[PDB]
Amino acid sequence: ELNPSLVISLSTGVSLFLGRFVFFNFQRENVGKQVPSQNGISHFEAGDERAKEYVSLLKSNDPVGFNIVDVLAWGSIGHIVAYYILATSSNGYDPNFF
Amino acid sequence: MRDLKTYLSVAPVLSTLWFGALAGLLIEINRFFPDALTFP
Amino acid sequence: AEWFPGQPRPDHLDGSAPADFGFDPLGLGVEPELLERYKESEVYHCRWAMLAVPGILVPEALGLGNWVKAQEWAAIPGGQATYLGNPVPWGTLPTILVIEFLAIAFVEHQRTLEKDIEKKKYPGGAFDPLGFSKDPKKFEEYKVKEIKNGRLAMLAFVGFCVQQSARPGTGPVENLLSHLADPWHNNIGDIIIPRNISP
Amino acid sequence: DISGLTPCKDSKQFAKREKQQIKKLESSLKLYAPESAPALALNAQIEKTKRRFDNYGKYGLLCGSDGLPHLIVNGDQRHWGEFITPGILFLYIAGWIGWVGRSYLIAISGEKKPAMKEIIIDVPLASRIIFRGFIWPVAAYREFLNGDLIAKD
Amino acid sequence: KGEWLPGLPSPAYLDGSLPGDNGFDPLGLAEDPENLKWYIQAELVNSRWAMLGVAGMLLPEVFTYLGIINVPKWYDAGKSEYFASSSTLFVIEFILFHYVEIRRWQDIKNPGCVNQDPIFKNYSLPPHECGYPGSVFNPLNFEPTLEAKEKELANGRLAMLAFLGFIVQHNVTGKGPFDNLVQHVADPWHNTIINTI
Numbered sequence: 001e002l003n004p005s006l007v008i009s010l011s012t013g014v015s016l017f018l019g020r021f022v023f024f025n026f027q028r029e030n031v032g033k034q035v036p037s038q039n040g041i042s043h044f045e046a047g048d049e050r051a052k053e054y055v056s057l058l059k060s061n062d063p064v065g066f067n068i069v070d071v072l073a074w075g076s077i078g079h080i081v082a083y084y085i086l087a088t089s090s091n092g093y094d095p096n097f098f
Numbered sequence: 099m100r101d102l103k104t105y106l107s108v109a110p111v112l113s114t115l116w117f118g119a120l121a122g123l124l125i126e127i128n129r130f131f132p133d134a135l136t137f138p
Numbered sequence: 139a140e141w142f143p144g145q146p147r148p149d150h151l152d153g154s155a156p157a158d159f160g161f162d163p164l165g166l167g168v169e170p171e172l173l174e175r176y177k178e179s180e181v182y183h184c185r186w187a188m189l190a191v192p193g194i195l196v197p198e199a200l201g202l203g204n205w206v207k208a209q210e211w212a213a214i215p216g217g218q219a220t221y222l223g224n225p226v227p228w229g230t231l232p233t234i235l236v237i238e239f240l241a242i243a244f245v246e247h248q249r250t251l252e253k254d255i256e257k258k259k260y261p262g263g264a265f266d267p268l269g270f271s272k273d274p275k276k277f278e279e280y281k282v283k284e285i286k287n288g289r290l291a292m293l294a295f296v297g298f299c300v301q302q303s304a305r306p307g308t309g310p311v312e313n314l315l316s317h318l319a320d321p322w323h324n325n326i327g328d329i330i331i332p333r334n335i336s337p
Numbered sequence: 338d339i340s341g342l343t344p345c346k347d348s349k350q351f352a353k354r355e356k357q358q359i360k361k362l363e364s365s366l367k368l369y370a371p372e373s374a375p376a377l378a379l380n381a382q383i384e385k386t387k388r389r390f391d392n393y394g395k396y397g398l399l400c401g402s403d404g405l406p407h408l409i410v411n412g413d414q415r416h417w418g419e420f421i422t423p424g425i426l427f428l429y430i431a432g433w434i435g436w437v438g439r440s441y442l443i444a445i446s447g448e449k450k451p452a453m454k455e456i457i458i459d460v461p462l463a464s465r466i467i468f469r470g471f472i473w474p475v476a477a478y479r480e481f482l483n484g485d486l487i488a489k490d
Numbered sequence: 491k492g493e494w495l496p497g498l499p500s501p502a503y504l505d506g507s508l509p510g511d512n513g514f515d516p517l518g519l520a521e522d523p524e525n526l527k528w529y530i531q532a533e534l535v536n537s538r539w540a541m542l543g544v545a546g547m548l549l550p551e552v553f554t555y556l557g558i559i560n561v562p563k564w565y566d567a568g569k570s571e572y573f574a575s576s577s578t579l580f581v582i583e584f585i586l587f588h589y590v591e592i593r594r595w596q597d598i599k600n601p602g603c604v605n606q607d608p609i610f611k612n613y614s615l616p617p618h619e620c621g622y623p624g625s626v627f628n629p630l631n632f633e634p635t636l637e638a639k640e641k642e643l644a645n646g647r648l649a650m651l652a653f654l655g656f657i658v659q660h661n662v663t664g665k666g667p668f669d670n671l672v673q674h675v676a677d678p679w680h681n682t683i684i685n686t687i
């Protein structure tokens with residue numbers, strides 16, 4: 001009886017809002033301090049040409065720098081939450097505690 | 099006399115005397131209090 | 139003063155801080171930064187515990203239920219809430235969970251953009267509309283009173299939890315009335331000594 | 338009772354074991370004169386078996402589905418006589434021995450050649466030390482507080 | 491300073507200055523001074539408690555045998571009915587002793603910490619010796635001479651031995667101390683420890 005489209009859209013919207021306005025600063029200040037490296041230098045600097053970061057992909061015109069990767073991550077979280085709600089509401093599970 | 103007392107204080111002689119006394123004590127305890135599985 | 143008369147006080151606790159009675163046997167606050175974090179954590183904990191005690195006591199005193207019973211309308215598929223004997227139209231678990239998560243996540247955030255160390259514990263401004271904090275001496279003594287009342291509220295919360303665990307299906311006010319009925323027989327004794335005469 | 342075991346005073350397998358032991362002992366009795374010394378010795382064994390089984394019944398032991406006593410170790414207050422009290426007595430005797438050994442090793446450490454008192458034991462010194470283990474818990478505790486128990490290297 | 495065993499020399503650390511010194515330490519428990527300072531306090535408090543305990547077990551049984559009063563035996567007074575139930579009494583005892591014994595311990599650790607009371611800061615315990623507070627604890631102002639301390643320690647040691655005797659006698663006979671004494675004195679030569687074994 002729960003509309004799948006409404007639940008999925010609302011969960012994705014809420015997750016994107018949280019990622020853009022609430023948890024943005026923490027995530028950015030944490031990724032700033034965690035860059036993978038081997039023997040004191042990054043993987044690309046070591047010689048791994050397949051480990052180069054995509055500068056042309058992560059850039060965006062958002063005022064705070066929200067990009068497509070953030071959209072994918074927060075949308076995946078929202079979809080997971082939405083489908084958890086739909087799958088947990090359809091079943092008739094009753095934990096008989098009381 | 100002194101030398102014999104020194105010899106009787108050597109490790110093997112003292113060991114056999116001590117373990118003989120212990121064995122006798124345990125044997126007599128088991129003779130008078132046999133088949134003990136618990137402590138009442 | 140001192141928490142343990144006749145005991146030297148630790149070097150990292152000199153009594154300048156509000157409610158500083160030199161209590162740190164395990165040495166958790168030796169590092170200054172950890173001590174500063176612990177101070178704000180303690181004040182934040184004290185305020186929540188102080189808010190909790192009236193909210194645990196008054197509803198049961200009014201006969202509205204019990205601080206443990208009031209949470210069991212959930213765990214029931216059709217469960218709906220109740221406020222002062224009045225059903226809450228939106229009082230269903232999936233809605234209240236989402237609202238609580240969003241509101242508390244938003245308010246706990248932007249509590250964290252405050253970087254001034256003194257104002258992480260005592261922000262003031264919109265949180266001090268009446269201006270009790272303008273006078274410094276009064277501000278310091280009110281800080282001492284806040285911490286001291288908060289510690290008592292914290293102890294009362296553990297009292298509530300352990301009383302609930304020890305005597306299931308009972309509430310703090312019910313426990314107080316039962317003790318006041320027969321104080322010399324309704325005590326902690328029959329619980330630490332659980333009705334087991336060893337002889 | 339505990340773990341599905343029944344007390345040995347109730348279990349029929351225990352009584353059946355007792356009956357079969359006496360029957361096995363009584364078969365060899367047939368090969369001797371009723372007044373002979375071997376007949377007197379097997380009768381003493383029969384009485385010993387009867388006393389053993391009666392004691393196992395009286396002490397309140399639990400028996401399995403095989404008729405044999407089973408020990409309860411978890412800490413039950415009605416089964417302390419099987420592990421707890423004997424264990425305390427063992428821990429008192431072993432600590433006594435260890436403490437008397439430690440004191441003797443300490444007493445001979447500061448000598449010219451202390452390896453000669455380890456193969457030829459100074460018996461009077463040992464006699465002095467031996468009876469200090471009767472209060473070994475108190476001394477062992479007290480050198481823990483002061484710091485004379487553990488070498489801090 | 492007497493000799494507990496005439497001929498045996500006294501240990502070096504037992505100087506004859508402490509009250510009740512008879513050179514009795516065959517097992518070398520008090521060789522370390524830090525241990526001796528603790529054992530003095532332990533002996534004092536144990537003797538003081540054993541004194542009261544022995545009086546409490548003995549005297550009401552003597553007065554019960556004479557008919558003046560009728561109270562249960564010391565080993566039977568536990569399961570009697572009182573106004574407060576055993577568990578409540580134990581909890582009250584635990585709280586009160588947890589206070590007073592920590593107050594006493596603070597004095598053992600350093601002599602002069604807990605002389606002043608918290609509630610009425612006007613008052614304070616005058617400087618004294620460890621184990622001998624006095625002032626309030628000595629309301630009648632009896633002088634703490636060496637003779638008095640020696641008498642206290644002797645009577646306390648006798649009381650501890652009496653307590654141990656009471657416990658073993660009840661464990662091996664099942665009756666009270668004074669009735670054991672009466673049974674022994676009634677016919678001394680057939681009522682001894684041998685006849686109970």
Ligand code: CLA
Binds near residue numbers: 435441442463466
């Ligand atoms: C003074 C005697 C004494 C003392 C206090 C200790 C103490 C210790 N030994 Mg040890 N040990 C001893 C003698 C002693 N041992 C002897 C003689 C041997 C050679 C057989 C060993 C071989 C040994 C090994 C292989 C291990 C220990 C370990 C240990 C430690 C753990 C307890 C243990 O496993 O015990 C077990 C003890 C034994 C198996 C040996 C006991 C031998 C007898 C009972 C001692 C007799 C002493 C002496 C003859 C009596 C003095 C008389 C004097 C008054 C005249 C503990 C610190 C363990 C360890 O380091 O882990 C922490 C370990 O792995 N010991």
Ligand code: CLA
Binds near residue numbers: 670
């Ligand atoms: C404090 C001193 C003291 C006194 C006066 C008594 C007196 C008595 N005890 Mg006794 N007893 C005591 C301590 C004492 N006991 C101790 C510490 C223990 C534990 C080992 C025992 C264990 C014990 C048992 C198991 C039995 C007695 C029994 C008896 C009674 C008759 C048999 C007898 O005395 O021989 C036995 C006496 C002893 C084994 C005591 C020896 C140990 C003490 C410390 C001797 C110290 C002597 C002391 C200096 C004398 C002080 C005298 C003074 C009061 C004037 C008698 C009334 C028997 C009884 O009740 O039957 C009627 C009995 O069966 N006692």
Ligand SMILES: CC(/C=C/C=C(C)/C=C/[C@@]12O[C@]1(C)C[C@@H](O)CC2(C)C)=C\C=C\C=C(C)\C=C\C=C(C)\C=C\[C@@]12O[C@]1(C)C[C@@H](O)CC2(C)C
Binds near residue numbers: 472542565
């Ligand atoms: C405190 C004490 C007893 C206190 C008793 C109390 C409160 C009794 C209370 C009750 O009765 C009443 C009031 C009323 C009842 O209804 C209830 C109970 C509860 C039953 C006994 C101490 C008892 C203490 C004792 C017996 C200590 C003995 C120690 C000895 C002998 C040590 C000797 C040595 O240590 C030295 C001296 C030198 C070393 O070198 C050699 C050795 C030998 C090791």
Ligand SMILES: CC1=C(/C=C/C(C)=C/C=C/C(C)=C/C=C/C=C(C)/C=C/C=C(C)/C=C/C2=C(C)CCCC2(C)C)C(C)(C)CCC1
Binds near residue numbers: 012071072073
């Ligand atoms: C531009 C712009 C804008 C807009 C934006 C938007 C609108 C965005 C969107 C976005 C989005 C819309 C996103 C989405 C995302 C999603 C995702 C990313 C998903 C994912 C999914 C998943 C991951 C799934 C999984 C799964 C599966 C597969 C199976 C089933 C189960 C599960 C669920 C597990 C605005 C106006 C603001 C402003 C500015 C301009």
Ligand SMILES: CCCCCCCS[C@@H]1O[C@H](CO)[C@@H](O)[C@H](O)[C@H]1O
Binds near residue numbers: 100103457459460
């Ligand atoms: C029972 C305790 C006393 C037992 C004394 C037995 C002899 S004591 C014996 O004496 C020898 C010198 O004669 C020493 O060399 C030796 O170390 C010593 O143990």
